[PDB]
Scaffold this active site. Structure first.
Site, PDB file in Angstrom:
ATOM      1  N   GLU A  35       0.823  -1.225   0.000  1.00  0.00           N
ATOM      2  CA  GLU A  35       0.000   0.000   0.000  1.00  0.00           C
ATOM      3  C   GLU A  35       0.854   1.269   0.000  1.00  0.00           C
ATOM      4  OE1 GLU A  35      -3.059   0.413  -0.458  1.00  0.00           O
ATOM      5  OE2 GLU A  35      -4.055  -1.528   0.075  1.00  0.00           O
ATOM      6  N   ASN A  46      -7.990   9.085  -5.098  1.00  0.00           N
ATOM      7  CA  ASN A  46      -8.887   8.159  -5.818  1.00  0.00           C
ATOM      8  C   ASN A  46      -9.819   8.871  -6.794  1.00  0.00           C
ATOM      9  OD1 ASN A  46      -8.008   5.780  -4.117  1.00  0.00           O
ATOM     10  ND2 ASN A  46      -8.994   6.989  -2.543  1.00  0.00           N
ATOM     11  N   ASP A  52      -6.375   8.464  -0.007  1.00  0.00           N
ATOM     12  CA  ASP A  52      -5.859   7.449   0.874  1.00  0.00           C
ATOM     13  C   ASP A  52      -4.574   7.978   1.576  1.00  0.00           C
ATOM     14  OD1 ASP A  52      -7.749   5.645  -0.056  1.00  0.00           O
ATOM     15  OD2 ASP A  52      -6.422   4.654  -1.482  1.00  0.00           O
ATOM     16  N   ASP A 101     -14.969  -4.413  10.453  1.00  0.00           N
ATOM     17  CA  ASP A 101     -16.159  -3.941   9.794  1.00  0.00           C
ATOM     18  C   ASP A 101     -16.942  -4.995   9.031  1.00  0.00           C
ATOM     19  OD1 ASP A 101     -17.679  -1.529   9.752  1.00  0.00           O
ATOM     20  OD2 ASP A 101     -17.207  -1.239   7.636  1.00  0.00           O
TER      21      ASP A 101
HETATM   22 MN   LIG Z   1      -3.622   1.527  -2.373  1.00  0.00          MN
HETATM   23 MN   LIG Z   2      -7.485   3.897  -3.255  1.00  0.00          MN
END
Ligand SMILES: [Mn+2]
Ligand SMILES: [Mn+2]
Ligand SMILES: [Cl-]
Length: 129
Positions: A35, A46, A52, A101
């Protein structure tokens, strides 16, 4: 901060991620590598206008407030800038809410596509923990 692999693993284990909701430490280290490449300052925007943030690439539509994402829910009750700190506490604490979640670590698309079903214990091999 750019963490080393074992340094991040130790920090994650300190903050109670090893076997959190049944996910061994290597899963978390693998997700962070793909990530953010272990960089606490990583940001990526995004298509939907959300962003993010940080080592686990936590999203501003649901989880933190960045002041530019309309209808943000801010379920972690934090400014997204808090997730870019050299101290990973805020990211870890928010990640624990995300994994709880319902979809587990499938919430991280890089985890599903690059870590799930692989030998994730490789990510902690050789580390003093
Ligand atoms: Mn990512
Ligand atoms: Mn993303
Ligand atoms: Cl699960």
């Amino acid at each position: 901060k750019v963490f080393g692999r074992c340094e991040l693993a130790a920090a994650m284990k300190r903050h109670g991620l090893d076997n959190y909701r049944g996910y061994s430490l290597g899963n978390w280290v693998c997700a962070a590598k793909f990530e953010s490449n272990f960089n606490t300052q990583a940001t990526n925007r995004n298509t939907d206008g959300s962003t993010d943030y940080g080592i686990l690439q936590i999203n501003s539509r649901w989880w933190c407030n960045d002041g530019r994402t309309p209808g943000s829910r801010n379920l972690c009750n934090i400014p997204c800038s808090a997730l870019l700190s050299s101290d990973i506490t805020a990211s870890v604490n928010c990640a624990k809410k995300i994994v709880s979640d319902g979809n587990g670590m499938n919430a991280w698309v890089a985890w599903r596509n690059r870590c799930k079903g692989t030998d994730v214990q490789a990510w902690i091999r050789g580390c003093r923990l």
